[PDB]
Amino acid sequence: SINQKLALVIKSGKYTLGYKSTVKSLRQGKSKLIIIAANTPVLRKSELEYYAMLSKTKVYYFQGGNNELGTAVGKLFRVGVVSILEAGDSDILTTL
């Protein structure tokens, strides 16, 4: 499941949380995937999509709000977008 793959990427690979860090990593071109929460503002989601199209990054639309995305990532706060820099031991990047 997506939650299991995200937990595996949390345990083994490299991840960043948040709009500002995600956009900065998209500018540097180091983001290999970005997960966007379902309740994120449509304007921010479209801007993230524009950045990911410019940098050829894959965009995965999480099936849940920022609360659910943060819980999946394993934090106790809200996460709107999470950028996966490398999977390490998961197949989240290789698939989809």
Partner 1 sequence: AKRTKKVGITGKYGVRYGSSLRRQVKKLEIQQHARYDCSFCGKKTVKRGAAGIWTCSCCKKTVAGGAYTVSTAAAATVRSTIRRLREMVEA
Partner RNA sequence: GGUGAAAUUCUUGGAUUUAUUGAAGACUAACUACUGCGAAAGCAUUUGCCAAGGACGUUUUCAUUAAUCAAGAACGAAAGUUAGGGGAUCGAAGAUGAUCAGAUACCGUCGUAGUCUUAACCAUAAACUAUGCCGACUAGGGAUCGGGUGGUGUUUUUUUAAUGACCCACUCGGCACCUUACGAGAAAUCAAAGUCUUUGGGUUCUGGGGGGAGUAUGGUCGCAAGGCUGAAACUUAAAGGAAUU
Partner RNA sequence: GAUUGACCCUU
Residue 3 interacts with RNA (CB under 7 A)?
yes
| 59 vs 31: CA distance, rounded Å | 10
Sheet strand arrangement including 81-86: 14-17, 81-86, 33-36, 58-61
Interface residue list for partner 1 (CB under 8 A): 37, 39, 41, 65-67, 78
In angstroms, give the least distance from the CB of 67 to partner 1: 5
Nearer to RNA, 3 or 55 (CB): 3
Contacts with RNA by CB under 7 A lie at 1, 3
